[model samples]
Target: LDDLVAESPRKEFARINMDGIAVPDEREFDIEADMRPHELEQESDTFGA
Candidate 1:
């Protein structure tokens, strides 16, 4: 995970919002994104299976 983040394809990744908007220069943003807790739990459960 560290390596993946270290080699992120995004030249400016930090300002990315949930709506797929890439704010390259500005550092402030507000966006809505899907955060499915159940889906995350299911994916995590299947990670080592």
Candidate 2:
């Protein structure tokens, strides 16, 4: 009953999996490219946004 109560919330199971460190995944993210300020500031709306 206690375990059932504890596991009542499904999201807790996934969270515990991450906390348990059963997942051995590695990742690397690099900003290979960047946008200029002009693109963000928009000289003109191409398709009216």
Candidate 3:
């Protein structure tokens, strides 16, 4: 496995609650960069194989 950089989609309707208040503040946030490597998976083309 090799080191990979992954990033998530941007959130347009993010919210943050302060002091357990019901009021939600509208905000936007972007996913932080992450480095995680994963193995490749092999799958069969035939159904139920």
Every model's TM-score? 0.13, 0.14, 0.16
Q: Which stretches of candidate 3 lie over 4 Å from their true place?
A: 1-35
* Per-residue error (Å), model 2, residue 14: 1.2
- Which of 1 and 2 is ahead in lDDT? 1
Encode model 3's per-residue lDDT on 1-49: one tens digit a residue: 2464555444664444346655333332112112335444866589765
Which 10 consecutive residues of model 1 have the lowest summed lDDT? 29-38
Using TM-score as the yardstick, the better of models 2 and 3 is 3
How much is the lDDT of residue 34 in candidate 3?
A: 21
Off by over 4 Å in 1: 1-18, 26-49
lDDT for model 2 = 0.43
Model 3 weakest 10-residue run by lDDT: 27-36
lDDT of 2 by residue, 1-49 (tens): 5555343456755565446555333332123223312244547658865
lDDT of 3: 0.44
Model 2 residue 44 CA deviation (Å) reads 11
